[PDB]
Amino acid sequence: KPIWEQIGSSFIQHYYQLFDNDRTQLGAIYIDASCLTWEGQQFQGKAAIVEKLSSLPFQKIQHSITAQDHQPTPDSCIISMVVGQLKANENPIMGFHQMFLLKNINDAWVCTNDMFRLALHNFG
Amino acid sequence: KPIWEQIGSSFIQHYYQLFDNDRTQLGAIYIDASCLTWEGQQFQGKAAIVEKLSSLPFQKIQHSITAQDHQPTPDSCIISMVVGQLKANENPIMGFHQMFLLKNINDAWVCTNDMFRLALHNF
């Protein structure tokens, strides 16, 4: 596995680990100039993003990754495309798609761009 | 609408028109450092990318955009995410999501990263 996949699959395992355990700690992987698009809604900067993710009405949420693709960018960045399932609260399982653009800053891979979108169960 | 927005949706519209009407002309939006991951398979470089897209058994295929989100990046690139459906030949309608990272080189917008995956669920 190339190094970008190793770094990439490592970043999303971490991301979903924190998201599922304590999403208030997610501010560490985002910077001031980070952009988030959540179901069409836009937020910029660490505070707004973490505030939006923390506002979510659920107490318990669990992500399950069905597939993830990684690639390096000419600017030495890394793009990750994830597809999966999520269980929030007592809600029926729901498929999801998510994109992360990662950049190395101070020997640390941070997310500058994040796009998330929900699917539709259609089953059950 | 902000400029990255205008660039993004414009590139996306232009990319599907090319893909559905003259794929051999798709190479022009790619450069040598462009990366394509098609349904899981990785292709790197314009030559390999053009080879893959052209070999697709798409006799009469058509893409219909369900939704698209655009964002500007710190390095002034544009990242676009698309959701929609695609119809090929007689084959039944299919779902899909695609990601495009755009960069302006030689004062022209090219695609450096492309990721495509089919989908059985809709939006």
Curated annotation (Swiss-Prot), chain A:
Positions of the NTF2 domain: 7-118
Gene Ontology cellular-component terms listed: cytosol; extracellular exosome; nuclear inner membrane; nuclear membrane; nuclear outer membrane; nuclear pore central transport channel; nucleoplasm
Modified residues (N6-acetyllysine): 1
Location in or out of the cell: Cytoplasm, Cytosol; Nucleus outer membrane; Nucleus, Nuclear pore complex; Nucleus inner membrane
Impact when changing residue 39 to K: No effect on localization to the nucleoplasm
Record bears the keyword rRNA-binding: no
UniProt entry keywords in alphabetical sequence: Acetylation, Cytoplasm, Membrane, mRNA transport, Nuclear pore complex, Nucleus, Protein transport, Translocation, Transport
Gene Ontology BP annotations: mRNA transport; protein export from nucleus; protein import into nucleus; protein localization to nuclear pore
UniProt keyword Membrane present: yes
Domain of life, source organism: Eukaryota
Molecular-function GO term, any one: structural constituent of nuclear pore
One matching Pfam family: NTF2
InterPro entries: NTF2, NTF2-like_dom_sf, NTF2_dom, Nuclear_transport_factor_2_euk
Description of how the protein assembles with itself and partners: Homodimer. Interacts with RAN (GDP-bound form); the interaction is direct and regulates RAN nuclear import. Interacts with the nucleoporins NUP54, NUP58 and NUP62 (via FG repeats); recruits NUTF2 to the nuclear pore complex a step required for NUTF2-mediated GDP-bound RAN nuclear import. Interacts with CAPG; mediates its nuclear import.
Functional summary from the UniProt entry: Mediates the import of GDP-bound RAN from the cytoplasm into the nucleus which is essential for the function of RAN in cargo receptor-mediated nucleocytoplasmic transport. Thereby, plays indirectly a more general role in cargo receptor-mediated nucleocytoplasmic transport. Interacts with GDP-bound RAN in the cytosol, recruits it to the nuclear pore complex via its interaction with nucleoporins and promotes its nuclear import.
Name the record gives this protein: Nuclear transport factor 2
Naturally occurring in which organism (per UniProt): Homo sapiens (Human)
Annotated gene: NUTF2
